[PDB]
Ligand binder design. Sequence first.
Ligand SMILES: OC[C@H]1O[C@@H](O[C@H]2[C@H](O)[C@@H](O)[C@H](O)O[C@@H]2CO)[C@H](O)[C@@H](O)[C@H]1O
Ligand SMILES: OC[C@H]1O[C@@H](O[C@H]2[C@H](O)[C@@H](O)[C@H](O)O[C@@H]2CO)[C@H](O)[C@@H](O)[C@H]1O
Lengths: 160, 160
Amino acid sequence: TTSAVNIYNISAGASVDLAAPVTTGDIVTFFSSALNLSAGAGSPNNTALNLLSENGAYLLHIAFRLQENVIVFNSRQPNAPWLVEQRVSNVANQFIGSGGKAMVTVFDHGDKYQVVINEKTVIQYTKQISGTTSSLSYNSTEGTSIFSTVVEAVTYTGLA
Amino acid sequence: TTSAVNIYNISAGASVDLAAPVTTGDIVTFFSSALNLSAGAGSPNNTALNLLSENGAYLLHIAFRLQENVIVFNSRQPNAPWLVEQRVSNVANQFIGSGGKAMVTVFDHGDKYQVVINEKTVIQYTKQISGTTSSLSYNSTEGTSIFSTVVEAVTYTGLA
Ligand SMILES: OC[C@H]1O[C@@H](O[C@H]2[C@H](O)[C@@H](O)[C@H](O)O[C@@H]2CO)[C@H](O)[C@@H](O)[C@H]1O
Ligand SMILES: OC[C@H]1O[C@@H](O[C@H]2[C@H](O)[C@@H](O)[C@H](O)O[C@@H]2CO)[C@H](O)[C@@H](O)[C@H]1O
């Protein structure tokens, strides 16, 4: 009876293939050592965190938009259009926990993803696409990330 | 099928009560923003991390001893003596390519606690005192702790 922990640094703009895969029952948390909710204007995304499947599809895209004051979730296929957007308003509100740092956890629930920011569940995203996560990525628009330039992802796998 | 993330700030010498007790299937991770592998000696423990009950049984005690150069895993009842110690030899070899921070993960697997330093499992530990983890502490000697002044503890609960 053995689960695993895996630890990745992700620079803004970079992707990472996962040493182990995230499937149902598993957890991935993105840790940022800074929080800039006065950061300015994304075009449109201040920061996006992404779970990507084997072929470069987005199972989950989490995008913080200060100037639109929303957090935007979505999925898509590789080279195909962005699917049905979901939104949660007030960005700065979901972060009242820690100043100067934050964490974003994605609980893979099989049919959904629970997304928790620090201690607060911000969406129970019903999946638009099924599949194993093999890749995580972090983007920003330069000069306006709400998060550090490096984000530490930790994965807890072997859970099921 | 909804999970909880709880975050806790533990200073050396302190104890914290979990708003969501840890049980079979659950996870604690302790995050040190420091790694001082030349801080010793301890008395004997440079650093200790503890998973307790409401009745205050040490369900899992993890002590780091630089001088004896060992990680001790033990448990004890409230106001009683320690049980059968388990010892892992060679402290810095448990932190291979750690750098200037560390994390320690405990999995509650029911029969055994699975302890992982960063990405390396260090022990599968046959429970000597059973049940759910209801509390956490961080103990250090003098200023000889191998971790940072404050450790951040993240619990993942409601997993199975
Ligand atoms: O859906 C996430 C996706 O949005 C793109 O921007 C959209 C915008 O959200 C939509 O309402 C607008 O009308 O058109 C834009 C282009 O699809 C982002 O550019 C993309 O990166 C994701 O963040
Ligand atoms: O065993 C957990 C507990 O150990 C104590 O030290 C032990 C020690 O490992 C053994 O060699 C010793 O001489 O008997 C001791 C029990 O008194 C530490 O004092 C303690 O803080 C814990 O880590």
